[PDB]
Specification:
GO terms for molecular function: rRNA binding; structural constituent of ribosome. This is 60S ribosomal protein L9, putative. This is part of a larger assembly, with one chain. The protein is α+β, with helices and mostly antiparallel strands and about 100 residues long. The chain starts with 7 loop residues before the first strand and ends in a 13-residue tail after the last helix. Helices cover about 15% and strands about 25% of the residues. It has three helices and six strands. The chain has a three-stranded antiparallel sheet with strand order 1-6-5. Strands 2-3-4 form a three-stranded antiparallel sheet. The structure holds one RNA strand of 88 nucleotides.
Length: about 100
RNA sequence: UGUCGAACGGCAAGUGCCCCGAAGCCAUCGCACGGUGGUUCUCGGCUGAACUCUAAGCCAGAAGCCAAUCCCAAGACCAGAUGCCCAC
């Protein structure tokens, strides 16, 4: 029924700094800044050191509690990347 | 037509009949007026986990509902505001 699988980790290099305050994430860089919200079941966001590691542990787990962990992993890396690299969007037409 | 002696003037015909008739009332027979904000689902879609719309994070919008304009109004008992004032 219920089990545990693993833990999720992200490294935070120079040029990017992440907080943990009110369990929310602040990521800044040298090309832009962005902050948002990533709450979910058993998903308590705690950043260990200021520039060491973004860790998000859950203690319970099932198909739904575990199909929601690594989406914050999909939504924390692009915080750290967009503040340094950024992704451009292009649009075309025809006539 | 009848009728007051006859005109004048009326009157009777439960308003004689007729033409016109203000006022009032009234006609899709006349006339005026009745084009507003959110919210969500269909849905186009975003990120991507475990590649796509959604499992969490999400814009967006027709109706829809919801208030609002509108009609009623505290037996919703208004410690709403306010005017005025007694005897004992």
């Amino acid at each position: 029924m219920v089990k545990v699988k693993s833990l999720c980790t992200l490294q935070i290099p120079e040029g990017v700094t992440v907080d943990v305050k009110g369990r929310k994430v602040t990521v800044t860089g040298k090309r832009g800044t962005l902050t948002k919200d990533l709450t979910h079941l058993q998903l308590d966001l705690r950043v260990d050191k200021k520039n060491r590691t973004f860790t998000v542990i859950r203690w319970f787990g099932s198909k739904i509690p575990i199909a929601c962990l690594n989406t914050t992993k999909a939504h924390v890396q692009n915080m750290i990347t967009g503040v340094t690299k950024g992704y451009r969007f292009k649009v075309r037409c025809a006539y």
